[PDB]
Amino acid sequence: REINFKIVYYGPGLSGKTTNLKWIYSKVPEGRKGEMVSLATEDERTLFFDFLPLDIKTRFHLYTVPGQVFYNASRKLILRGVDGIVFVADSAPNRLRANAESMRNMRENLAEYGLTLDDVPIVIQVNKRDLPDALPVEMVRAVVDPEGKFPVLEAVATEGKGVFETLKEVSRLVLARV
Amino acid sequence: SLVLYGAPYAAAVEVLEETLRETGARYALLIDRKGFVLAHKEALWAPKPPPLDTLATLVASNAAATQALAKLLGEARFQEEVHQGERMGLYVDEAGEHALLVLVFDETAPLGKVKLHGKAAAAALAAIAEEAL
Amino acid sequence: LVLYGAPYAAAVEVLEETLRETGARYALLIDRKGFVLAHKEALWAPKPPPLDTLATLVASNAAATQALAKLLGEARFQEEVHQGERMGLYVDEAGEHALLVLVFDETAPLGKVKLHGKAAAAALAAIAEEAL
Ligand SMILES: Nc1nc2c(ncn2[C@@H]2O[C@H](COP(=O)(O)OP(=O)(O)NP(=O)(O)O)[C@@H](O)[C@H]2O)c(=O)[nH]1
Ligand SMILES: [Mg+2]
């Protein structure tokens, strides 16, 4: 009947993690989706997580994690059992370091589960390519994936650009392991 | 993961229907700690339930967060949880290390029987879950 | 919601008293984003586990359980008491914008915990309101 998979969206505050789910939700037909759930603060910064369940019998559970540094304890929990990860990096000059800290943070959290960055498929999304001062892609990429060992996709998640292909690619990788 | 197919699944469903009979509860679920609905049953008499997937992520994450707090207080675990409104309530308990028993109930169901059979049901499902890991 | 000056001294005074009346180790007043607004430790008790972590977890948890309530047509569930072999935790709303947490061990009698717990929450609620 049905295999279940968990996908997590990771990355620094404001990089667009929640926006990816909002897009995806707005374009998947009713019949291939359940309702989206968000536990967010008053300023729509995610506090616990987002959750969106979907069809592609293979069921994908997508989650977002809160990116702000001081929400680490909830971030940890949301990675439990993860099967595939989308790391959404920010394109803004002033957020490059935020990117790297979040990546170092993701290795630290996985290591508490006994997992390395080799153990879970990971897809890098460089989001926010519309910004006037957008850093070159390979610079942002060099910071997060110094060895180029992870697929890269460019995105403007506020407009849909890259949202689904990023999703397809992490999907592709998770199935290729099963 | 946790492959719940075949004879385990049928046993699991049997424990859930029996639990609804004995307790007067509206909805019974077996979920995993990741959030995945593994088996569920509704009291025939009961209205349509709220979206079961929403309910299951919320309960997984509530179990995960309270278990994180037990851990940071030096404790292996807290006790089973009952959440109680003016009319509606939830009973959540451990179905072994990988799963949760959820029961949703209302003002018609005697809380005492919820806990007593809630507990019995949890232990029965632990037993089925261990045979299917 | 930031407590400072006199409102802050007021909140501190409720926490010390609550700690004395119950035998609990630590009492916190946290906002619903998980920021610690104030706190006190009993002089006799160990160095606490990390309270910023504790607060975040407590606030996340409150988000989930408010969301379960709403999903069942309920305004809220009631106050929560979590209990282990020896350690426990009392959580209660102190108004719309904040929570009161008490952390206690086996020497804190549960009845006292709940009674004073409830009163502190009410007290803290009023300080938080009259601070706007
Ligand atoms: N220009 C531009 N803005 C974007 C893009 N993606 C998201 N934004 C904006 O960035 C802000 C943050 O988006 P959000 O998804 O809430 O970020 P998040 O990663 O979920 N943040 P957090 O971890 O705090 O929940 C919003 O204003 C959103 O519209 C983008 O690709 N380009
Ligand atoms: Mg978010």
Overall residue count recorded for chain C in this entry? 132
C64 interaction partners in chain A (CB closer than 8 Å): 39, 48
The partner residue sitting opposite C63, judged by closest CB among A47, A70, A73, is A47
DSSP-derived pairing of the beta strands C88-93 and A152-154: unpaired
**For residue A126, what are the contacts with CB-CB under 8 A and spacing of at least 6?**
A89, A91, A137, A140, A141, A152, A153, A154, A155
Query: Comparing C-alpha atoms, which of C33, C28, C25, C79 is closest to residue C51?
Result: C28
Torsion sign (Cα): B80, B81, B84, B89: negative
Residue in A8, A19, A102, A153 to alter for ligand 1 test, most ligand atoms within 8 A of Cβ: A19
Tokens 């374009």, residue? A27
Which segments of B1-133 does DSSP mark as H helices, in order?
A: 6-23, 52-72, 111-130
CA distance B55 to B29: 10
Q: Which long-range contacts (CB under 8 A, 24 or more apart) does B40-47 make?
A: B40/B16, B41/B13, B41/B16, B41/B17
Verify whether the Cβ–Cβ distance C82 to B76 is below 8 Å. Answer: no
Assess contact for A120 and A84: CB atoms under 8 A.
yes
Q: Two tokens at A135?
A: 């850093």
Cβ neighbourhood burial of A18 (10 Å; 0-12, 13-18, 19+) = buried
Is A68 near ligand 1, meaning CB less than 6 Å away?
yes
Measured in angstroms, the resolution is 2.7
Q: Residues of B within the annotated binding site?
A: 80, 93
CB A89 within 8 A of CB A145: no
Residues A17 and A64: their CA atoms lie apart, in Å, by 6
Measured CA to CA, the distance from residue A173 to residue A60 in angstroms comes to 13
Q: Determine contact, residues A28/A103, Cβ cutoff 8 Å.
A: no
Quick one: which H or E segment has residue B91?
Answer: strand B89-94
Q: At what angle do helices C51-71 and B52-72 cross, to 10 degrees?
A: 160
Sequence ranges of the domains in chain A: 1-178
Which residue from A133, A76, A80 is spatially nearest to A106, judged by alpha carbons?
Answer: A76
Interface test with B, best of A48, A62, A65, A174 (most B CBs within 10 A): A48
Residue C99: which domain range?
A: 1-132
The span from the CA of B91 to the CA of B43, in Å, is 16
Q: Is A91 in the pocket of ligand 1 (CB under 6 A)?
A: no
Question: Class for domain A1-178, per CATH?
Answer: alpha beta
Q: Check if the beta carbon of residue B30 is closer than 8 Å to that of residue B16.
A: yes
**DSSP conformation letters of C34-46:** S-EEEEEE-TTS-
Q: What number of other Cβ atoms are within 10 A of residue A6's Cβ?
A: 22
User: What is the CATH classification number for the domain harbouring B82?
Assistant: 3.30.450.30
Nearest residue on chain A to C64, judged by CA atoms?
A: A39
Q: What is the DSSP letter of A53?
A: E
Residue B125 to residue B85: CA distance in whole angstroms: 27
Residue environment code for A76-98, b if the CB has 16+ CB neighbours within 10 A, otherwise e: bbbbebbbbbbbbbbbbeebbeb
The whole-angstrom distance between residue B96's C-alpha and the CA centroid of its chain comes to 11
Q: Can you say whether the dihedral through the CA atoms of A48, C49, B67, B89 is positive or negative? A: negative
Which 3 state secondary structure label does DSSP give C26? strand
Which segments of C23-130 does DSSP mark as H helices, in order? 51-71, 110-129
CB atoms within 10 A of CB B77: 14
Site from A61, A72, A109, A177 to mutate, B interface, most B CB atoms within 10 angstroms:
A61
Query: Does the annotation list A90 as a binding residue?
Result: yes
Structure tokens at C25: 């180790």
Judge if the beta carbon of residue A151 lies within 6 A of ligand 1. Answer: no
- From its phi and psi, is residue A121 left (phi > 0), alpha (psi between -120 and 50) or beta? beta
Q: For residue A146, give the DSSP letter.
A: T
Residue with structure tokens 């019998």?
A57
- Report CA dihedral (C49, A66, C3, C68) to the nearest 10 degrees: -90
On whether the CB atoms of residues B75 and B66 are closer than 8 A, the answer is no
Q: Which residue has the tokens 């979206």?
A: B51
Inter-chain touch B55–C67, beta carbons under 8 Å = no
Length, in residues, of chain A: 178
Q: Which amino acid is at A55?
A: D
* Nearest ligand, measured from the Cα of A91: 1
The CA distance from B40 to B37, in Å, is: 7
Where are the alpha helices (H) located in chain A, listed in sequence order? 17-27, 72-78, 96-112, 137-144, 163-175
CA distance A129 to chain C (A): 30
CA–CA gap between residue C54 and residue C34 (Å, rounded): 9
Q: Count how many domains chain B has.
A: 1
Q: What determination technique applies here?
A: X-ray
